[PDB]
Amino acid sequence: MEIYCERVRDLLNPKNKGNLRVREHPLLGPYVEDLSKLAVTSYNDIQDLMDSGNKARTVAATNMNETSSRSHAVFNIIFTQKRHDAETNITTEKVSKISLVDLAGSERADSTGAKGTRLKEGANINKSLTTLGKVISALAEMDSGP
Amino acid sequence: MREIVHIQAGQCGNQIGAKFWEVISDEHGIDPTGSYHGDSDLQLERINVYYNEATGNKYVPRAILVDLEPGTMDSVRSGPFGQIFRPDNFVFGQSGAGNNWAKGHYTEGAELVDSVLDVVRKESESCDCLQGFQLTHSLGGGTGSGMGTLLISKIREEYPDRIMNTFSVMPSPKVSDTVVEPYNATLSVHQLVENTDETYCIDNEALYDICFRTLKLTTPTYGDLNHLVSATMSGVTTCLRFPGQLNADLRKLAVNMVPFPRLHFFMPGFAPLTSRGSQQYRALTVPELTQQMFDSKNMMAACDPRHGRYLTVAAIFRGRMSMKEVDEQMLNVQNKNSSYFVEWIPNNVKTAVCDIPPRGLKMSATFIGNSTAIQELFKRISEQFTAMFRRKAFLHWYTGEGMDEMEFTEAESNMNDLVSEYQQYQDATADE
């Protein structure tokens, strides 16, 4: 999934003009509703899915980088272990989540030659990054204190 | 130029808007037919903020009326100012919401929202440089909450840059008129906290208290409450329309008021108030207005500001007055009640002054306060919400219209998080 400007967009799902809603399960916490969750059985499948996702990502050029990113990106892998000793053990014992996050780089505006739509994208990116910095500092202070 | 678009939804919003239009028109001098009959030349200088031209030297307000019951539309048309509005802007349906948030938000409102949005696009396209929107509605009701929230969401989606305001009447603590107020109020606040840019919290109990204690009326009706609210609404946006020594756009108020994005709930106030037959005793001046303005009895939010701290505050004066007196009075108020002001904002009073006072008021002042004590209001609703959600008192009416318990749970959690944020600053100490 990608976060472009406070909207979640799916990448493996083909061209879909609509956005995806964010809802909080009372027990499992935040999540995104109707994310195209795809299974895999061969390395070729995940490789092709990764290629398609990188292709469909929104990317624009600027003075700092010919191919910069205009959106935060999140890659998630859900992995299940099934122990099937029929005499003793049970299946679906362990479920694990692996998350890999690529964040957009802070924009300095005047140094990047941003203008028009690029400037608004930079502003939204900076707002998100500042919020991230505030939580990080707060959470660090909180765990350090207690 | 700064054009505002005005929307009204539900019985409460429509009646408030009718009274408000009957006021602004006098301030600018417009006859009920539409023609202009005034005396000063400043009245037409900025009339385009609210009104559009029409060929016969006529003025039509830039308003939109919304409901799902023809009764309120009929009442508004069959009235003193019914002929001032454009007929095409009367959008309505039949088989109203019936005090059900689900019917307003999902089932019935979803049909009429497209027509309402078409009218809104047509009205906004003609504006030269649109400033923002404003919408009047009641949270405890049906039609108002659902359709207002849906329209706010859609308009924010389409016009992300402009300002959105709201003058919402919240459920009162004790004077109640609907049995399922908490569900609608919670579900509405869950979206208001996210989408809009400012919100002014009105409560009927506070208005009745002002009417009976200050104005000394004997049989207040909803007309007087609409009067007070209209006075405040007109006073907030004066600096767009008349010249002054210190202007204050809506965006400037937004920047100076809210310190963080989620804390955009305000308590409004207006001064003076002599109750008549006692105007000859009170000497009207700047310190008298400041004394009446910061008093607790005057507040319209039905919440005591002494139980928290003022995150910040803004005062808009209208009259011909000296700047030193204003600055000295605001400094004195800040220094005297030093406990009730947050300590990590060195100066937390925004000031504006305009030269043209109301028709017959040598002076006037409007007050917009942002204080932690507002959390009390939300807590009340939350408590009542739990008392009816633990046993699912009236839930099936909502679930029959396409909802689920998860929606209620996330709304309750979001409002509780709001209460926790406001409570984070309320206590003293904190400091550096």
Added chain:
Amino acid sequence: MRECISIHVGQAGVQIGNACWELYCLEHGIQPDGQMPSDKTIGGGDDSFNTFFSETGAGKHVPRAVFVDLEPTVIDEVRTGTYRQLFHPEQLITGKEDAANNYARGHYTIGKEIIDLVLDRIRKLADQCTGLQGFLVFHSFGGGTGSGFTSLLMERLSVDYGKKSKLEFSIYPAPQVSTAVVEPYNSILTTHTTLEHSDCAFMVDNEAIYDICRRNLDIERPTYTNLNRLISQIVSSITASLRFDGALNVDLTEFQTNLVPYPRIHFPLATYAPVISAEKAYHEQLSVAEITNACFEPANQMVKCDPRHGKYMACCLLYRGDVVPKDVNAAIATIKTKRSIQFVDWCPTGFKVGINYQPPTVVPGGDLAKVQRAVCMLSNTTAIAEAWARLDHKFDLMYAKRAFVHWYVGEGMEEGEFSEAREDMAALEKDYEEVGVDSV
């Protein structure tokens, strides 16, 4: 020919410009419509002086000024006011909303789209000039437009014209009274352009002038009009040497030669000595010694800072009216004798003196009395820092929690740009604490 260009930015600048141009039109005998009937009665002279007014074919005089703002109200008061026929119709309004006390809006998003028109108008005015001497920019810290657009305009002017002088008059935030909760952010951000590109910046505070009006002039409820009239008197006294004859004359280059010992120390204070009501105008001689002693009184400073806590590094005195050099020499000797006024060891001379014959004028409906002698002092002291220190404290108290920062970030500003400016400010203050240490 001696010529200057005035730029007024923001509401404060425009109002100060109204008061200023009222005074200038009164001084040279120009009616509000631009006509000058006295030429028909006098029959000669260049009394329609080129320092501020340009003369067309039909005898009309048009001032050399540029007004700028991002909202239409304040200038629309002038487009339909008493002076509607004086100015050129090109007044450069932005037909949109205002910066809303946001530096980023006034420097990045909304501040542009009107900068090019301003530069074109200034180009036309400078090209029409012949011997341009300097720019006089009026603005105010704490406002979105007056900070951001002033920064952008000053940067462009420094890039474009380069070697011309650029003075600056500004309304600095007061220690206690204020009218906005985000003033410190705007002032600290504005520090860069006034530090790097400006050539000499004068500071003014509202609290100081309120006190002066209360005590000297006996006005209990003053408004902004009195403030602007006093500032206009100061600016006129500064610029008078370019216009009228005098025994000792001082150009703008003289100010920039005698008041700035080093490039980064160009922030002097200004005072005007004979401020007195008509009722108290009697009972007092108002001689040269009295008015020049009144300048050093700490209570008459135009900024709420105590000069006694620092050291005087330079002083310019500008006299108007019936003044003789013997008296000013005696006054300078007397001031040098006193001990409360401390001069740095590396400036044995200290004083520069200028004298002009034209006495100050009186506006109808004013508050200042008619006087025969007037003085304006421009003093470069090390007390200023103190005021800066106070403002810095406020900034820190709001930046520890990142309050109001998202408004700035959402309009193109980056967060780190805050911190840099603060550090820059700290650097200037330290260089105003070493330039005064006694030599060893």
